[PDB]
Amino acid sequence: MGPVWRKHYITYRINNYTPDMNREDVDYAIRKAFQVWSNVTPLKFSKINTGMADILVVFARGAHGDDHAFDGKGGILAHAFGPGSGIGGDAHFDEDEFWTTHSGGTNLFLTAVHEIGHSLGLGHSSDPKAVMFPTYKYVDINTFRLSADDIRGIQSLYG
Template identity: 25%
Template sequence: MPFLLLLIIFIPEVSAVSGASSGKILDNPWDHSPITVYIDDKNTPLHYSPTYYRQVEKALEYWEEGGNGNLDYTPVFEIINSEEADISIRWVENLESIEGAPSGVAGYARPRVSGDRFVRVDVVLEVGNYQGKGWRQYGDSTMLTISKHELGHALGLGHSNNRRDIMYPQYEMRDNINPILLSKYGGLLSAAGLIALIILLFLGISWQYSRRKRKKLENECFNEDR
């Protein structure tokens, strides 16, 4: 069942916000390159999956390769092990319960601005949300989408009105594979799949053998009757 997630940005009053049609907060918010990034995979919540780190790396690669095509510059990132990085990324269990965010918000970017430049951007991503009373863990594909979106804000992009654009402020999360369960039981699932395949092959071979044997008997009976 689809579940709608909201993606937001906190825009400081001092920032120069462009018109809604441009979809930009700042045209070129960074005055240097590479843009340093700190990914906090140490202070993580209970349901954090180690696979999320790779999704952030893929999101960085996405923007380095051009992203949605709306940037006027080509960003170059450098991941460093320092909280003093230009962009700091961390995870929380749930934004609504931990930081009082509106219901359904899956991530946010909070830039600190000086003049017409970003000084620092804090990106916070949640690892899951509540659907009714039940907890729903985000899969890797959802985390990748959220990461791409919030990094777009960190590069100066605002929200888009195009539903197909990564910067559209809503994301419809469909059935997703829980990465924690996959890491725990992936081996068992693979083994079960292999066993099922062997059984299907055996049944197929047995059916072919029985079919040939039945046809042979039918031919013998037909010849005797003649």
């Protein structure tokens, strides 16, 4: 259930960049992660560099100014706030992970899909093939698809 955005145009901004990947690969992973969700809802996402974005994307370490301190390498990979003003919507990625484009380390795209689900108001799935299942798993990103449960969940919130 959860809170939802009360509009269908949502902006995001990348506050800072992990040194683990180059800038263009970070931008690509995030853009594609938003596209997964826009593909099955009325939502549209635009990246901005200037202005007040709804969803701020942040890489940070350990205790980083909120109530969800990170824990070093492993364990919690990221956390995101549900829809709302201010820190609402924002997605934080633990810099103590090694973010990648691929299967090594922690794949940024797949983690971002999961986190953006939370930023849009989804909770966890019991479907062990759903991207909103609680625990990270690498799957071939070239053939990645939302599960029927993920699509059901997001279409129940928007549209």
